[PDB]
Design a protein around this nucleic acid. Structure first.
Length: 84
DNA sequence: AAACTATGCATGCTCTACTGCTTCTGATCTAGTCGACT
């Protein structure tokens, strides 16, 4: 007896770990809205690898996911509160 | 002394093979578009 269930594996270094976790934990709509807000309001580009500033060509790496929200001037939300 | 035949040379045509140069074809590869997923 056995059943087929899909599984997805993704790898990322420790430096890019918080960004990957944020991008792969939140909902699709939440990620879209966060990326749109980052691009429009603050002018920064957010993706699964890191946060980039077109003006200054320097990455905004961080050691935790809380810092990612803190940089964007946004109140932190737990994963359970990111549903859409 | 005369006729036949052995021996050789010069040349054109043809099969057969071999070496080298050039060109064509089969095989090994990056850009554009659509689509899948997350």
């Amino acid at each position: 007896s056995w059943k087929a269930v899909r599984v997805d594996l993704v790898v990322a270094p420790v430096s890019q770990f918080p960004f990957a976790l944020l991008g792969w934990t939140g909902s699709k709509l939440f990620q879209r809205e966060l990326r749109r807000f980052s691009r429009k309001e603050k002018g920064l580009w957010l993706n699964s690898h890191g946060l980039f500033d077109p003006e200054q060509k320097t990455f905004f790496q961080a050691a935790s996911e809380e810092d990612i929200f803190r940089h964007l001037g946004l109140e932190y939300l737990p994963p359970e509160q990111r549903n859409a």
